[PDB]
Design a protein around this ligand. Structure first.
Ligand SMILES: [Ca+2]
Ligand SMILES: [Ca+2]
Ligand SMILES: [Ca+2]
Ligand SMILES: [Ca+2]
Lengths: 148, 647, 613
């Protein structure tokens, strides 16, 4: 993780929080095991340490968020590098949480005007949201920007 | 005037560079010039700059590595030399190379046994809206904000403690909350706590107050750094079992209750001025809390409180409409029928069994008015005058009406004891302000009173700025009418027989109230028709209908930032009701501890249902894995696109 | 104080784990500790938890496989043991392995002949807003909700029937409609029909009513599970020939008409309280039907019905404006000119040819009053009381007005038999409410009647909460004027001569109706002008103009939610009119069957132009 952007931290931190089931800040064999075999399959509980000790940099038996972050640095995001969508997201995002929300996008459009109805804002977000949390990523926002 | 003297000193610096042979050769890396000038001649290198520089400072400030390395041989001591005076006091060159995010000169400077304990007590380093930064004091704190990890790490390995404090008493942690780049500084906060390996017996660095007594937990709540507030919440929640899609954690609930004297979150939330600090009430352990404080134990004492106020005012009006009255005394209407009045107010007549009933209720209003002042003795004596206005605007902007209600009741209690004549003029103000003061309870009784916020929000601002442009157009035209009907006999058209009523007369034409003066039987002068139609076309056709449209647009710019004001005002109503009410009823909220073997901390549990989000969790698992109105909505995205794009 | 005890149970649980030496070892994967503790000493393992646990329940619930397998050696009988009482009743540990979506444990559990039909009857499983989920009772149903296919497939093959019911009678099919995740639960409805290979004599599993008697088709209608409702229609539609871009399909039309007693879709749609269920009327086998039932056979009776009612109120007024009156009787104007009234109401005089006409017309109102009440006698005797107000606000919120119109006419019918004096006040309310009731017919004549939808939507809500802020600003100022004009001779300025009328005076100023008091000839007291100027800047410049803009903004938040209200209300006009009108006219809609040798079901065809250029 030589250089990253704020969004890339913030979304991966949401990933790490979603992946860490007990919120201890670490990842153990029991934790990674169940959520992986929640998704249909089942690794045979030997791949799990082979998952961790492949990536555990200090060998403490846990995966802290920096080890989690440098793993995603090797599973790096694609070549979507710009400058204006970067600037467009800062003007939109008031608190700078990295996730432009419903009421924020209502707020910015209100200062431009055009009187969006509450249902009409929900039609904007639900189509733009790829994974389905009702919030737009930085990665999701550029796909509405470039082409349809 | 103050900003120019700062600026003039800055241009005063550059002339010293452009005249010195040394420092101009130090601004560039003119090593050929720098070699010959130093070793040959006999000149000291203690040439102070205009803001008190040294030549060693300049190479760092214009980020020039190879020049200052030559300076180390000639100058063994100027690393130890701070800067001189009044803007950059004590700023050594170790600070400046850190601010440039590297020079690998921190290698060389710490090779020259440079102190890491210097303090930058200068003017332009203090927290102020004049400055544009706030880096604190110590070089450890300067490396904290530019987010350079190995530069931080190198400094711990040379004996730099983490418990330095500024003049405010802030630690290095408190600096990080105030930095504007939020999530990109969230990572540093975990990094520094890892170097609390020596658990000190005082407190483990996360509890240290400032000079105004604030934890770093509370400090984010004051400034609304929600993302940092989200992160510090993580170390306090304590999760129990999980059940499929269900999860039952257990929140900490210690520094967010009104138990201690510190007041601990909620009074500190409502007493700020910042708008973005109100946002914290959406976050998860707080929004759930005050709902439990309101629906249980908050609402029913509040509604039962206000009904006692309702029977108070009703009891006042009954002892208002019954007053001791005589017929008009012996003086007849001595002005020629321009003086019709008929009672003049009985003097000392109580000798009736009926008025003893009136004697009862008239005392009770006096008794209650004393109690209102007794609540408001300490409030005015402690919370300043302008400090009271800071309390005022957000959630309590009535609070003087209930004071002035207590004046006028005490005036009319005085006024009948001396028994002077003018007793009606307090009785007006003591009546309308009483019934208006029941609108304080519009917050309660349902969410069918956020109007009283908007009618506050709009009576200032909009109506206030509209009042002046009334008050001058009316001031000419009322003065215009007095000139033209000066000549006339006011037995017809008695609007305008004198000047001070003519303003009041004109005021009713402006709001389409009075009939509009016309006689149709006696000819009125020929300047009236030109002036009056010109008055009508502005006042009730241009100006007044402009008010509605100007009221129209301002209704829905604040449609969203109204509803959260209502939910904010309940919390402010809640705590004030708690503080001035004793216990042995509506107990200290949440569930008590240490019967369950946990400790004196008190808790509440929250159940919630997550989701699965199957399409996002595949790509993270494969990162582990080894070797309608659609066209309407998309046009708005196009409208979002075309308005933003370059133009 | 009710759910407060629920948490207090749940903290009491964890303390038992922190104080039992066995269970804390069972909370973790403590292989060595549970090795030495179990096999060696002689202590029972029947330690029930705070809510009736076993050692096996905790190790299951904290998702720990390897410690559970060791417990299986010491436990031949903990598998059959359920949890004890008051929240988690009857729930065996087989359930918990299902909810955690696998542990490779149901393998080991069914190796130990676990029962597959234990019924989790606990308190935390009933459908309620208190619980955050509703999964039913049987463990076969639990795996259906978490969408784990081979876990389901494993459960059939050990003999779990797919026809259990809960206390609510709902099947495992019915649970899938109530789930919040819709398209991810669609395939389970396919897969569970696939294991209905026994064609039963009773019904093929899709026709089981619950205890409130609902098929899983119709239950999708009430909850508005639209995407599922789109999917269930797909089996019923019976496509005919295709012709290029044309397709003449044929929908089934059996369980959605008003023929049976079950009311089958339509009355159940309008009697919901949920908002999203009105979305169903846009779907293509239903939207076509109400256009046929209204444009033919529904409109012209409703327009003809309102014409008869329109002549009723006219014939009421013509027997209203003619009353028996006389000159004032012997009592002269005994109050000094504050008592002007002059006629007083003839006693028993009909002896004219003209009043012979009026007695006919007066009876026309009376018979029409009784017919209205005979309609509404059985209605409140069947639809409870509060149930009727659940019916009310949607499409019949008049329904007391038509009752109170019939009420007051019976009052004035009595009032002239006893022939008392104060007869004008029942005549008043019946006259205004008679004309106000004809706004009920505004649904027809074209779509120029969602005003009566909107004017209901706004007289409640907006104007209702605005009146209380009126009701106190009016109250102080009116009380203030009565004090300041207490002194005066009311011969001039008769606005405020006594405290009752000064309220009603002030209410006239507050809407800027009465002219605003002035005399210009008498020096009126100075405290009036300061007060009255403070009134107008509140009353007709702040408060009332605020009412317009607050009216303005609330009108276009409900623009899109206006047109669905109208088309909702036409159906409620339609089906009530079908229900109260007999047949031998406007027949059971759609094309009959079984003359074409097709079946006793009745059908309708719909063409459409397709797409995919
Ligand atoms: Ca984890
Ligand atoms: Ca690690
Ligand atoms: Ca945001
Ligand atoms: Ca997203």
């Amino acid at each position: 993780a030589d250089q990253l952007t704020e969004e890339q931290i913030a979304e991966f931190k949401e990933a790490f929080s979603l992946f860490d089931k007990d919120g201890d800040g670490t990842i153990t064999t029991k934790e990674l095991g169940t959520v992986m075999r929640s998704l249909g399959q089942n690794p045979t509980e030997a791949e799990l340490q082979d998952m961790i000790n492949e990536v555990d940099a200090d060998g403490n038996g846990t995966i802290d968020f920096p080890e989690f972050l440098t793993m995603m640095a090797r599973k790096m995001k694609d070549t979507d590098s710009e400058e204006e969508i970067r600037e467009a997201f800062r003007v939109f995002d008031k608190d700078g949480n990295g996730y432009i929300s419903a009421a924020e996008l209502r707020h910015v459009m209100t200062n431009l005007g055009e009187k969006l109805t509450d249902e009409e804002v929900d039609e904007m977000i639900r189509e733009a949201d790829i994974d389905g949390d009702g919030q737009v990523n930085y990665e999701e926002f550029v796909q509405m920007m470039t082409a349809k | 005037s103050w900003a120019q003297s700062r600026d003039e000193q800055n241009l005063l610096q550059q002339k010293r560079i452009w005249e010195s042979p040394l420092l101009l050769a130090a601004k560039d890396n003119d090593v050929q010039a720098l070699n010959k000038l130093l070793k040959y001649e006999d000149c000291k290198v203690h040439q102070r700059g205009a803001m008190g520089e040294t030549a060693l400072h300049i190479a760092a400030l214009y980020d020039n590595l190879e020049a200052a390395m030559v300076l180390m041989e000639a100058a063994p001591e100027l690393v130890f030399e701070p800067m001189t005076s009044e803007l950059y006091e004590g700023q050594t060159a170790l600070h400046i190379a850190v601010v440039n995010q590297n020079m690998n000169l921190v290698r060389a400077l710490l090779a020259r046994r440079a102190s890491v304990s210097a303090r930058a007590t200068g003017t332009a380093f203090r927290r102020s809206p004049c400055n544009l930064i706030y880096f604190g004091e110590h070089p450890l704190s300067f490396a904290a904000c530019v987010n350079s990890e190995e530069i931080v790490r190198l400094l711990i390995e040379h004996g730099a403690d983490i418990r330095a404090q500024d003049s405010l008493g802030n630690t290095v942690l408190h600096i990080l909350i105030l930095q504007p780049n939020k999530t990109f500084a969230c990572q540093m906060y975990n990094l520094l706590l890892s170097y609390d390996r020596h658990g000190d017996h005082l407190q483990p660095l996360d509890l240290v107050p400032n000079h105004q007594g604030l934890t770093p937990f509370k400090l984010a709540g004051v400034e609304g750094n929600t993302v940092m507030f989200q992160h510090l919440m993580q170390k306090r929640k304590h999760t129990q079992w999980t059940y499929g899609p269900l999860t039952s954690t257990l929140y900490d609930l210690t520094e967010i209750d009104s138990s201690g004297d510190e007041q601990s979150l909620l009074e500190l939330i409502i007493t700020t001025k910042k708008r973005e600090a109100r946002q914290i009430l959406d976050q998860t352990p707080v929004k759930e809390l005050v709902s439990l404080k309101w629906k249980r134990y908050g609402r029913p004492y509040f509604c039962m409180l206000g009904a006692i106020y309702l029977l108070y005012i009703i009891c006042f009006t009954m002892c208002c409409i019954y007053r001791p009255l005589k017929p008009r005394t012996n003086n007849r209407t001595s002005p020629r029928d321009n003086t019709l009045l008929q009672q003049k107010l009985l003097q000392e007549a109580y000798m009736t069994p009926k008025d003893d009933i009136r004697l009862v209720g008239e005392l009770v209003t006096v008794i209650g008015a004393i109690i209102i002042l007794l609540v408001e003795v300490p409030d005015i004596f402690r919370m300043g005058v302008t400090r009271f206005f800071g309390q005022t605007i957000l959630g309590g902007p009535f609070h003087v009406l209930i004071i002035t209600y207590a004046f006028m009741v005490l005036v009319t209690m005085v006024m009948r004891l001396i028994s002077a004549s003018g007793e009606v003029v307090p009785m007006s103000f003591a009546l309308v302000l009483g019934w208006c003061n029941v609108m304080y309870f519009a917050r309660g009784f349902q969410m069918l009173g956020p109007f009283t916020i908007m009618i506050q929000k709009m009576i200032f601002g909009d109506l206030m700025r509209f009042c002046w442009l009334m008050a001058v157009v009316i001031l000419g035209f009322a003065s215009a009418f007095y000139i033209i009907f000066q000549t006339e006999d006011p037995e017809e058209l008695g609007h305008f027989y004198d000047y001070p009523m003519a303003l009041f007369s004109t005021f009713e034409l402006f709001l389409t109230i009075i009939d509009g003066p016309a006689n149709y039987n006696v000819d009125l002068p020929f300047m009236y028709s030109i002036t009056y139609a010109a008055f009508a076309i502005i006042a009730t056709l241009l100006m007044l209908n402009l008010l509605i449209a100007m009221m129209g647009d301002t209704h829905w710019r604040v449609a969203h930032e109204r509803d959260e004001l209502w939910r904010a005002q309940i919390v402010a109503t809640t705590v004030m009701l708690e503080r001035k009410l004793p216990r042995c009823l509506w107990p200290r909220s949440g569930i008590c501890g240490r019967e369950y073997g946990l400790g004196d901390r008190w808790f509440l549990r929250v159940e919630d249902r997550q989701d699965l989000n199957r399409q996002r969790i595949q790509r993270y698992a494969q990162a582990f894995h080894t070797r309608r109105s659609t066209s309407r909505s998309s046009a708005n995205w196009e409208r979002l696109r075309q308005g933003t794009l370059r133009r």
